[PDB]
Amino acid sequence: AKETFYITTPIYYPSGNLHIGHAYSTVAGDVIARYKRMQGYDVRYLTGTDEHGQKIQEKAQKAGKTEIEYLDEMIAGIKQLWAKLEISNDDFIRTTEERHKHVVEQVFERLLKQGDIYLGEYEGWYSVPDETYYTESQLVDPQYENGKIIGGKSPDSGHEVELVKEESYFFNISKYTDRLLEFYDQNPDFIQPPSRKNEMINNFIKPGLADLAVSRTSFNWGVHVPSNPKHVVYVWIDALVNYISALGYLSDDESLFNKYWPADIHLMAKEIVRFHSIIWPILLMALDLPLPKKVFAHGWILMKDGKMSKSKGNVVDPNILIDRYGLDATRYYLMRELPFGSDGVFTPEAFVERTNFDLANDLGNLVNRTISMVNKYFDGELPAYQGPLHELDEEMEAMALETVKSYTESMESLQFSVALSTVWKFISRTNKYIDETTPWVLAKDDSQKDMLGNVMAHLVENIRYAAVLLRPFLTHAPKEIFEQLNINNPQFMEFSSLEQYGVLNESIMVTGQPKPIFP
C-alpha cells in the first residue's frame, strides 16, 4: 500500500487581495505535493482561509456587506487564483465552515473541562496604524504614573497606543515547556531551516511562556465559546485547528484524520513559525494528539525596502504575471529565483531575464533545434537509442544519472532553486552537445548516418529526462514536450523511467509541425 503524505499551507487572511507572497507558499506546497505523488505517495494537500476577527468585520462594513458576503467574494477570487496557478490542492478549508467551527468549539470546551483554560482579563496596548497589540514592555517612550505604565508609543510606527482591557480566557501553555523542548531534542528536523530554532527559543521560550489569551469579548465575528457565547475564540485555537478540522477530526467521519494526521510538513513564512512550533504542538499535547513531523518556514519576497504585504500595498499580483508571461513562467520564477529559506527582492527585470533565458531560450531552443533536425535529417523518424556511440556519450549519460540523483537530494531537503539549477546545468549541457557534435556536418556524409541518429537519440533522451524532472514545477511544458516528441508511453513520463538511460529503443515519429514550448 501507498504511504500517506500530508502537506499544508497557512490559511490566508482575506483582509485584502493575495499577492505573489501567497502564491510562493502555495506553489511551493504544490511542487512538493506533485513530487510526492510522482514518488508513489498517497498525498493530501490542504490550503484555506482564516476568516474571523475584527479586521474582517471592519472590511465587510466598509464595503457595505455582511461578513459572509464579503468573505464568499474574497474566497471565490482566491479559489480562482489557485485554479489559474493549477494548484493540486485536495481541499480548501474555510474557518466559517461548520466542520471547522465544530472542532474549535469542542477543543475549547475540552480545554475548559481539563482546566487548561481559565477565565481572566486580557490587558494590552493597541496601535491603530499598526493594527497590532503590544505588551507594556514593548512600548517606546513609556509614560509613568506612580510607577505604572499608563501610555507609550508603538515600537514599529511610533504612534501613540491605547490601553485595552477585556474579559478573556487564558490557556496555561507553560506546563508543556519541558515536553515541547524534549520533542525538539528527539526530532532534530522538526524546525526547518534549523537556523530558525535558536532565535525562536531564545526570544519566546527562554523567558517563560506566558498564559495565552485565547478568547476575546470586544467583538462578535468569531467562533463563539458554546458555554460562554459573549466570548469568541481568538486566532490561536481558531486558525491552528484548520489542519485537523479539514480532516474531519471530532466529526462523524474521522477517516481522513485517521489516515493522514500527523502532517508531514506545515509550510509558512518565518513570521508565523513560532506559532506553529510552540503554540500548535502544545495545543496538540492538550488534545493528546500526534505532533506534526516538520514545520518549514521559508523567507520573504521583498519589495520597496520591505516584506511584500497586502496591508502596505507594495505588491505584485500573480494574476498579472500569469496573464502577461504565462503560467509556467510564473511558477518557474517563484521556485527558482528565491532560494527556499532566504529572503529576496522581486524585480520585473529579474523575472523576464529568468524566464526568457532559462525557459524560452535554453529549454525552448533545445527542443526546437532537436525536433527540426529530426524532421530535416530523418523525415520525422527518430532513430532508436542503441548505446553511447559518440566519444562524449558515456560522460553525458553519467551526467544524466547524476542530475537525477542530485535533483532528488535537493528536492528531499526542499532546496527547490538548487534542484532547478541542477536540471538547467543538464539542459545547458545538451545545447552544448549540439555545438560539439555539429549534426549538420554529420548529415553531409552518408557513412555518418548512424552516428547522426545516435546524436539525435541522445538529444531527445536528455530532453525526456528534463521534462520528467520538471513535472512537479511546470504543469504545461512537460506535456507539450512529450506531445511534440510523440512519446506516448506513460511509463516514460515517470521517475522510475530515469533509472537507466536510453529507454527509446523503438523508432518514433516526432511532430511534423513543431511550435515553441513557451509561453
Ligand X SMILES: Nc1ncnc2c1ncn2[C@@H]1O[C@H](COP(=O)(O)OP(=O)(O)OP(=O)(O)O)[C@@H](O)[C@H]1O
Instruction: Using alpha carbons, select from 90, 154, 189, 104 the residue that is nearest to residue 412.
Output: 189
Q: Does 201 bind ligand X (CB under 6 A)?
A: no
Q: Nearer Cβ to ligand A1LV5, position 204 or 495?
A: 204
Number of residues forming the site for ligand A1LV5 (CB under 6 A): 25
Q: Does 235 bind ligand X (CB under 6 A)?
A: no
Residue 275 interacts with, from ligand A1LV5, ligand X, none (CB under 5-8 Å by kind): ligand A1LV5
Per-residue contact string for residues 262-291; x = within reach of ligand A1LV5 by CB under 6 A: ----------x--x----------------
Instruction: Using alpha carbons, select from 410, 413, 442 the residue that is nearest to residue 426.
Output: 410
Q: Which of 21, 152, 222, 453 binds ligand A1LV5 (CB under 6 A)?
A: 222
Find out whether 206 is annotated in a ligand binding site: no
Q: Does 293 bind ligand X (CB under 6 A)?
A: no
SS3 call for 163: strand
CB-based closest residue to ligand A1LV5:
53
Q: Does 205 bind ligand A1LV5 (CB under 6 A)?
A: yes
Q: Nearer Cβ to ligand X, position 93 or 301?
A: 301
Q: What are phi and psi of 141, to 5 degrees?
A: 50, 55
DSSP 31-64: HHHHHHHHTT-EEEEEEEE---SHHHHHHHHHTT
Report the chain's terminal Cα–Cα distance, integer Å: 39
Number of residues forming the site for ligand X (CB under 6 A): 18
Q: Which of 195, 218, 255, 311 binds ligand X (CB under 6 A)?
A: 311
Q: Nearer Cβ to ligand A1LV5, position 41 or 275?
A: 275
Q: Does 186 bind ligand A1LV5 (CB under 6 A)?
A: no
Cα separation, 135 vs 151, in Å, equals: 11
**Which amino acid appears at position 363 of this protein?**
L
The nearest distance, CB 278 to ligand A1LV5, in angstroms, is 11
Instruction: Using alpha carbons, select from 282, 286, 418 the residue that is nearest to residue 342.
Output: 418
Q: Nearer Cβ to ligand A1LV5, position 269 or 329?
A: 269
Extended strands (E) in 109-245: 117-127, 132-134, 140-145, 148-153, 162-171, 191-192, 212-213, 215-216, 232-233
Instruction: Using alpha carbons, select from 203, 193, 227, 253 the residue that is nearest to residue 119.
Output: 227
Residue 185 interacts with, from ligand X, ligand A1LV5, none (CB under 5-8 Å by kind): ligand A1LV5
Residue 53 interacts with, from ligand A1LV5, ligand X, none (CB under 5-8 Å by kind): ligand A1LV5
Q: Enumerate the β-bridge partners of residue 233.
A: 215
Which strand (E) or helix (H) includes residue 68? helix 67-84
Residue 257 interacts with, from ligand A1LV5, ligand X, none (CB under 5-8 Å by kind): none
Q: Does 263 bind ligand X (CB under 6 A)?
A: no
CB-based closest residue to ligand X:
21
Exposed e or buried b for every residue in 226-251, given b needs 16+ CB within 10 A? eeeeebbbbbbbbbbbbbbbbbbbbb
Distance of CA 447 to the CA centre of its chain: 53
Q: Which of 6, 7, 8, 12 binds ligand X (CB under 6 A)?
A: 12
Q: What secondary structure letter does DSSP report for 174?
A: G
Q: Which of 35, 170, 190, 234 binds ligand A1LV5 (CB under 6 A)?
A: 234
SS3 call for 65: coil
Q: Is the dihedral of CA 384, 385, 390, 393 positive or negative?
A: positive
Q: Does 29 bind ligand X (CB under 6 A)?
A: no
Asked if 404 and 498 count as a contact pair (C-beta separation under 8 A), the reply is yes
Instruction: Using alpha carbons, select from 161, 186, 9, 145 the residue that is nearest to residue 85.
Output: 9
Q: Nearer Cβ to ligand X, position 75 or 366?
A: 75
CA angle 37, 334, 499 (to 5 degrees): 40
Q: Does 53 bind ligand A1LV5 (CB under 6 A)?
A: yes
Residue 269 interacts with, from ligand X, ligand A1LV5, none (CB under 5-8 Å by kind): ligand X
Part in contact with ligand X (CB under 6 A); list of ranges 19-27, 34-42, 164-172, 228-236: 19-27
Asked if 53 and 235 count as a contact pair (C-beta separation under 8 A), the reply is yes
The nearest distance, CB 286 to ligand X, in angstroms, is 24
Q: Does 13 bind ligand X (CB under 6 A)?
A: yes
Q: Which of 145, 185, 253, 446 binds ligand A1LV5 (CB under 6 A)?
A: 185
Q: Nearer Cβ to ligand A1LV5, position 55 or 99?
A: 55
The nearest distance, CB 496 to ligand A1LV5, in angstroms, is 39
Q: Does 23 bind ligand X (CB under 6 A)?
A: no
Residue 50 interacts with, from ligand X, ligand A1LV5, none (CB under 5-8 Å by kind): ligand A1LV5
Range 381-384 contact pairs with CB under 8 angstroms and sequence separation of 24 or more: 381/507, 381/508, 381/509, 382/456, 382/457, 382/460, 382/485, 382/504, 382/507, 382/508, 382/509, 382/510, 383/453, 383/454, 383/456, 383/457, 383/507, 384/457, 384/504, 384/505, 384/506, 384/507
As annotated, the binding site includes 310
As annotated, the binding site for ATP includes 310
Which residues are near ligand A1LV5 by CB under 6 A? 13, 50, 52-53, 55, 177-178, 181-182, 184-185, 198, 201-202, 205-206, 222, 232, 234-235, 238-240, 272, 275
